[PDB]
Structure 1
Amino acid sequence: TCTGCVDLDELSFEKTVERFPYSVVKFDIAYPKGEKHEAFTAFSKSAHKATKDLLIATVGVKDYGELENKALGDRYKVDDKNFPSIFLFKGNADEYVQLPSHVDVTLDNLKAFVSANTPLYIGRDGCIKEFNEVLKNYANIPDAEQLKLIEKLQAKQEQLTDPEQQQNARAYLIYMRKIHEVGYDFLEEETKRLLRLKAGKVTEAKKEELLRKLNILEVFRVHKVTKTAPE
């Protein structure tokens, strides 16, 4: 019944799914043991760390005795002969997305199932998904495109709500502006400064703020430098 996973049944399923904006629910046997269960469990804990908007829930389905949650199982066409079945909801118990059954049940595919199908994001502390989406090969894009992204992400920064999140966004833009100004050498430089900071006397909170900056700086790395300038 994994840590953090709310255990749901026929009277409570729909009412609870529909009070959350997003829900990921595992249908499975009653009393799951195994690697597929241990990964859900691991995903439960990681999810709880990254968000407050996401229900992580479980439905245990029986057929000895009084077949608990058989009805509920059928409501979702779940293959009793092929558990775990994993579903994502968006606040409507009538409309769901199913992890295809050929996908392995790992931490990382569970996170990718969520990122691909919602606004939400389960990854490294300090990151902001709508910012990562526009930022792939930032380092290599033309000067004019780079600045138009600055306009854009500055738009997004202005309307941001969480203290923390406002601050994640100031780091993104500081880095976007420096790479634009100085080029790709700013990564090696900033990385060296932050790690040295983190090798100092710091409070856990300062530590965690230093990991968010290194996490964000990480988004700007490119496999190959493809822009150069001049002499």
Structure 2
Amino acid sequence: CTGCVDLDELSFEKTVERFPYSVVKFDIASPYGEKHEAFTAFSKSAHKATKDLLIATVGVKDYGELENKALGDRYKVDDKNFPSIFLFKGNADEYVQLPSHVDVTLDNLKAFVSANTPLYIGRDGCIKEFNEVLKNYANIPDAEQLKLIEKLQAKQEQLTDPEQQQNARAYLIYMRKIHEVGYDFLEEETKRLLRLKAGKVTEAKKEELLRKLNILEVFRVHKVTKTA
């Protein structure tokens, strides 16, 4: 899958031991289907979020020299019940396995990382360096809102990743609209977005809307404390 590093008997231990954390799916060689697609989606997500996590695959072949059988056997991977998902903590000796009962989904894989490492794969659309300064934005004073607009506008112009540049536009719109009209903007925009999301929409269009809804979520506050 895109971003998934496929490892073998020669590369596995050496590569795992060079990253702070690795998540490895052991499966048949040339895997396919729902769990693999989830692992693919996971690779994409993890990649957008961090550089300290290796996303890797090991394909155990049933043919010829049985490449990677020894590797599978080192970790006692149940080859009657592929795929098997492992998380390694910086070397090939210190690891945890994904319980065999847990469905191999994008959500469950994100959860696996966050339960077993200091790493966090955020929501699609989010930008961590924006989020870290935006807590409680709707409630802070106008001058501090304007300072943050100027700051994140400067950050946006430096953004080199195309998705982050697009997602930054939504952050800025929301920052400006909330500064202009106040927290009522959250409800307005949530209803607009949900009307769209409730229409007949393609998967791509849904993903676009969800990214807007995820960025807008950053602006929700538990309590409105600023005057409207």
Superposition TM-score tier, normalisation by shorter sequence: 0.5 to 0.7
> Number of aligned pairs?
228
How far the C-alpha of 1:147 sits from its partner, in A, is 21
**Bigger Cα displacement from structure 2, 115-124 vs 130-139:** 130-139
How far the C-alpha of 1:85 sits from its partner, in A, is 0.4
**Bigger Cα displacement from structure 2, 213-222 vs 98-107:** 213-222
2:18 touches 2:91 (CA, 8 Å); kept in 1? no
Q: Give the secondary structure class of the aligned counterpart of 2:23.
A: strand
Q: Which runs of 5+ in 2 are unaligned?
A: none
1:121 touches 1:129 (CA, 8 Å); kept in 2? no
Q: 2-side partners of 1:75 and 1:6: how far apart?
A: 19
Q: 2-side partners of 1:26 and 1:161: how far apart?
A: 31
1:108 paired residue number = 107
How far the C-alpha of 1:124 sits from its partner, in A, is 2.3
**CA pair 206-4 structure 1, distance change in 2 beyond 3 A:** closer
2:45 touches 2:124 (CA, 8 Å); kept in 1? no
1:50 touches 1:125 (CA, 8 Å); kept in 2? no
How far the C-alpha of 1:221 sits from its partner, in A, is 4.0
TM-score by length of 1: 0.60
2:137 touches 2:145 (CA, 8 Å); kept in 1? yes
Q: 1-side partners of 2:12 and 2:211: how far apart?
A: 36
**CA pair 21-157 structure 1, distance change in 2 beyond 3 A:** farther
1:43 paired residue number = 42
Q: 2-side partners of 1:203 and 1:67: how far apart?
A: 42
TM-score by length of 2: 0.61
**CA pair 116-146 structure 1, distance change in 2 beyond 3 A:** farther
What CA deviation, in whole Å up to 9, does each residue of 1:120-164 have, x standing for no partner? Answer: 222226758899999999999999999999999999999999999
Q: 1-side partners of 2:106 and 2:24: how far apart?
A: 15
Q: Which runs of 5+ in 1 are unaligned?
A: none
Q: 1-side partners of 2:159 and 2:191: how far apart?
A: 29
Q: Give the secondary structure class of the aligned counterpart of 2:80.
A: helix
**CA pair 101-205 structure 1, distance change in 2 beyond 3 A:** closer
Identity %: 99
How far the C-alpha of 1:63 sits from its partner, in A, is 2.7
